[PDB]
Amino acid sequence: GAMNSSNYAELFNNDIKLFVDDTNVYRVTVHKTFEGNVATKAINGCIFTLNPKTGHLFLKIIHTSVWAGQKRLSQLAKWKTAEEVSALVRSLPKEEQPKQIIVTRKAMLDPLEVHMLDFPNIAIRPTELRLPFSAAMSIDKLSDVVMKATEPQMVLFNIYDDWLDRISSYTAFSRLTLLLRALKTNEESAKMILLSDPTITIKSYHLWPSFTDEQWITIESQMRDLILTEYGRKYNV
Amino acid sequence: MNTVPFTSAPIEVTIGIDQYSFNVKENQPFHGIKDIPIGHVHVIHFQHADNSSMRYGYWFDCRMGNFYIQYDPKDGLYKMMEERDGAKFENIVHNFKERQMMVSYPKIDEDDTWYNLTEFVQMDKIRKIVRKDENQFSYVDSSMTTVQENELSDPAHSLNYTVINFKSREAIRPGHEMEDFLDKSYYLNTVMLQGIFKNSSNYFGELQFAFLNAMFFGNYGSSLQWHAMIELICSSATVPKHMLDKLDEILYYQIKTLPEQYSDILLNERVWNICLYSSFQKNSLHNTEKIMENKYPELL
Numbered sequence: 001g002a003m004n005s006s007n008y009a010e011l012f013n014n015d016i017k018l019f020v021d022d023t024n025v026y027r028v029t030v031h032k033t034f035e036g037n038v039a040t041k042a043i044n045g046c047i048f049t050l051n052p053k054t055g056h057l058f059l060k061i062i063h064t065s066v067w068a069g070q071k072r073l074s075q076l077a078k079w080k081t082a083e084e085v086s087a088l089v090r091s092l093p094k095e096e097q098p099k100q101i102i103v104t105r106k107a108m109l110d111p112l113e114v115h116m117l118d119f120p121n122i123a124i125r126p127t128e129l130r131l132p133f134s135a136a137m138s139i140d141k142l143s144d145v146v147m148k149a150t151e152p153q154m155v156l157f158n159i160y161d162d163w164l165d166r167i168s169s170y171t172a173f174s175r176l177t178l179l180l181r182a183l184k185t186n187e188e189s190a191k192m193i194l195l196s197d198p199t200i201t202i203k204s205y206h207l208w209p210s211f212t213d214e215q216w217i218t219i220e221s222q223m224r225d226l227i228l229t230e231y232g233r234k235y236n237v
Numbered sequence: 238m239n240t241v242p243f244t245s246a247p248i249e250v251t252i253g254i255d256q257y258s259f260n261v262k263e264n265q266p267f268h269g270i271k272d273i274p275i276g277h278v279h280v281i282h283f284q285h286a287d288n289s290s291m292r293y294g295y296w297f298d299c300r301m302g303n304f305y306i307q308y309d310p311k312d313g314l315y316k317m318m319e320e321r322d323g324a325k326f327e328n329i330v331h332n333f334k335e336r337q338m339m340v341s342y343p344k345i346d347e348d349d350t351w352y353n354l355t356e357f358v359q360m361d362k363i364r365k366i367v368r369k370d371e372n373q374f375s376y377v378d379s380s381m382t383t384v385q386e387n388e389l390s391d392p393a394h395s396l397n398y399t400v401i402n403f404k405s406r407e408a409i410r411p412g413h414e415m416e417d418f419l420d421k422s423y424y425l426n427t428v429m430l431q432g433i434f435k436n437s438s439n440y441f442g443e444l445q446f447a448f449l450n451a452m453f454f455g456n457y458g459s460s461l462q463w464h465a466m467i468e469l470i471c472s473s474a475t476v477p478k479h480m481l482d483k484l485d486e487i488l489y490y491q492i493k494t495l496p497e498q499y500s501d502i503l504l505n506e507r508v509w510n511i512c513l514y515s516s517f518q519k520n521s522l523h524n525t526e527k528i529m530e531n532k533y534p535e536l537l
Contacts, residue, residue, distance in 0.1 A: 079415035110404070114414045117406050 003102050004128035011052045012169040017100040018058075020085055021048040021133035022108055024146075025062050026077035042067050044146045045077075047084050048136045051098075053169045055160030059142060060084045061149040082111035088154075089119060098122060104131050131177065138183035138190070139207050161206040166213060175220065179208070182223040185230040193222045239299030240330045240339065241281060242269035243315075244307040250315065253282035253294065253453060255351050256494060257343055260286075268338035269306065271330075273299055277355050278363065280377075281306065282453050283315050292454045293378035298360040301373045305329070317374045353490035354449060357442035366397050366446065377450050383458035396450070396458060399433055399443060401465040403472075420517070422475040429469065437480045440466065441487060448491050451503055463491075464508045471516035481521040489524040492532060500533045510537055 003010070011017065025047055028040035045062035062080065070076050089097055100123045101116070103109060113124045137143050145155050160172045167175070182190040200209045211219055231237070246267040252259050254270050261267045273279055282294030295317035297304050302319045303326040309316045320326040333339050344351070360373075367375035383396045402408060408424045409417045417423055434440040444466040450459035470476055470484055495503060513519060513526050514537070530537065 076415070083414065110418065111415070113404055114409055114418050117404065117409060 002126045002128055009170070011173060013053075015099045016051070016096065017053070017102060018085075018098045019048075019050045019052060019102050019104060019131070019133065020081065020108060020112070021050075021104040021131070021136070022078060022081040023105065023134040024048065024137050025081050026067070026073050027137075042073070044149050046136070046142070046146050047081050048133050049085060049088060050133070050159060052173050055158040055164065055169075055172060057157040057159045058088055059136075059145070059155045059157060060088070061146055061153040061155065063149055063152050066152065078107055078111045079115075081108060082115040085112060086115035086118075089116070089122070100125055102127050104129075104133055132180035132184040135180040135184035135187075138180075138187050141202075141207050157207065159207060161203075161208055161210075175216070178220060178223050178227075182226050185227055189226050189230075190223065193219065193226060238272040238342075239275055240269060240271045240334070241273065241297075241299075241317075242305045242326075242329055242333055242339070243267055244305065247308045247310065249286035251284045251286065253280070253284075254340075254342060255279055256354070259340055266338050267340075268333035268336070269340075270342060271334060271339040272341045272344075274342065274344060274351070275299060277351060278358050278360050280449065280453060281317070291379055293376065294453060295374045295376055296360070296363045296367070297374035301360060304374055317372075317376070319373060350490065350494060353486070354494060355445060356487070357438050358445045358449075359442055362439060362442050363446060366443065368393070368395075368397060377454055377456065379454045379456060381454075381456060381458070383462060385461070386458045396456070396462075398447060398458070398462040399429070401429070401462070401469055403469075420472070420474040421469055422473040425469050425473040426475065437477065437483070441483065445487060445491075452491075452495060452499070455499075455502070460503060460505075464505045467512055468508050468516075471512035471518040471522075474517040476518065476521075481518060484518075485522045485524045488522065489528050492525060492528045497532070500536060504533065504536055506536050513537065 025045045027043045027045045029043060030038055030040055033039050042064040044064060047058075047060040047062065049058040049060065050056070062077075062084075066080060067073050067076070085101065089101075097119070099121070101112060102125045103112060104127060106126050109124060109126060116122055116124060137146065139159075142157070145153075159176060163172045163175065179190070179194075182193070194209060200211060200215065202209050246261045246265050247263065249263040250261050252261055252267075252270075254273070270281070278296055278298050280294050280296050282292060284292050293314060295304075297317065303321075303323065304317055305320055305326075306315050307318055308314075320329075360375075363375045364370065364373075367377060369376065377396070381394060381396050382390075383398050384392075385398065385400045385402070387395055388400075400407075403418065403421065403424075407428055408421070410423060413423070430437060430440060434443070444463060447459045447462035447466065450456045451463055467484075467488065470480065509529065513522065513529060
């Protein structure tokens with residue numbers, strides 16, 4: 001059933017599983033029309049499909065052309081998400097197919113369940129966790145590839161870069177969720193924290209800066225401070 | 238007008254005949270029920286006074302044979318049986334009538350309640366849901382489980398209602414996932430009506446049978462089936478106009494007949510709110526919506 005704090009270590013066991021986040025699939029800018037009414041302009045989206053054990057990210061780019069002449073787009077987006085995840089499972093060899101898919105939003109359960117009827121052995125599961133995967137579009141290189149797509153495209157990343165060479169999946173996922181939580185609470189501050197020292201760069205094949213173990217401890221501390229500050233602000237506490 | 242004689246009434250019992258019910262005391266000289274209208278199925282049903290658990294009963298049609306009830310003191314129940322000797326039967330019934338030891342099926346002349354609840358229900362269809370082919374009548378009780386419930390465990394004593402599952406390959410065509418799930422028209426019209434039931438009469442017959450088994454035996458699986466068959470029509474954007482008008486009449490009489498006190502366990506709040514206020518057919522069941530709103534406004 002539902003994934004929570006109590007069954008957290010399960011993410012890092014040897015059963016292949018994917019997280020699916022649909023929060024950046026349908027994205028609009030709201031504007032005034034010449035007549036002073038309001039309209040939306042769709043911009044490119046993405047399905048965020050993440051193996052939390054390996055760091056493999058299947059970033060399915062949603063080009064705005066998939067909304068052309070469609071009604072009830074926020075509803076269609078859940079079904080388009082489910083269709084793309086099903087197609088991704090079908091394209092993987094049997095031994096790479098997930099044994100579980102965890103949806104970060106409950107509204108994805110029925111659409112994914114319906115698209116995966118051919119896969120009765122793949123458990124479709126909600127979570128109680130509040131994962132900050134919506135902030136994926138605050139990672140510059142992910143944002144860049146989505147905004148530049150001129151057609152539907154799948155792009156493979158490792159969202160952990162080369163961290164697993166030095167840390168466990170558990171630690172890698174905790175660092176990722178802290179970075180994303182930070183980028184979500186105060187993007188400007190978070191990104192300042194990540195690039196303030198120009199000596200530490202982002203390798204061409206990476207998403208995050210090449211921090212030493214010691215430099216990551218300092219970064220991780222600055223993100224926790226960022227998050228607690230912003231919290232005392234939000235809530236005047 | 239046909240008769241179901243009783244050999245005797247050895248144990249205190251509430252006897253139901255269709256929508257009527259009578260109290261019979263232990264060893265009361267009760268010898269059965271007369272003036273049963275020909276042309277409809279009937280159900281005769283029982284709740285022992287000493288064990289108000291296991292309601293049980295027999296679906297029968299008097300055109301199909303001479304039926305009587307006899308208490309079996311081993312199995313501890315009133316059992317329906319067939320008398321093959323026509324002259325023995327006529328002779329037994331004539332005696333019990335002359336001695337007026339029978340209750341009369343108490344139909345009010347104006348009252349079409351039973352017709353309206355059983356309009357599409359046919360004994361031959363009942364015998365396919367309740368398989369016991371050596372008998373021309375069908376036994377149902379409170380605890381009997383449905384073929385669908387057994388999938389999720391004695392197959393001989395199961396209710397073989399048509400399996401309806403909105404998240405099944407049967408219900409959902411490859412490449413029409415969102416369309417078939419949000420509009421069940423192809424599931425209703427091609428899979429169920431054209432494919433399995435053959436026509437709307439057989440579909441409504443099973444719907445009506447499921448309801449009555451829910452109300453008279455509190456059979457929970459029957460209740461699930463009744464709600465599934467309603468929800469499949471309400472969730473279809475495309476339903477023949479005659480089926481919508483008939484469904485409204487069917488549900489109106491079911492809601493009208495439900496004991497006021499059982500609304501809480503026999504009516505599914507999600508299915509009714511969805512059907513009356515959200516579904517494609519939310520404006521197509523006027524009679525049903527007016528009776529539900531005036532009789533069970535709490536549920537909505």
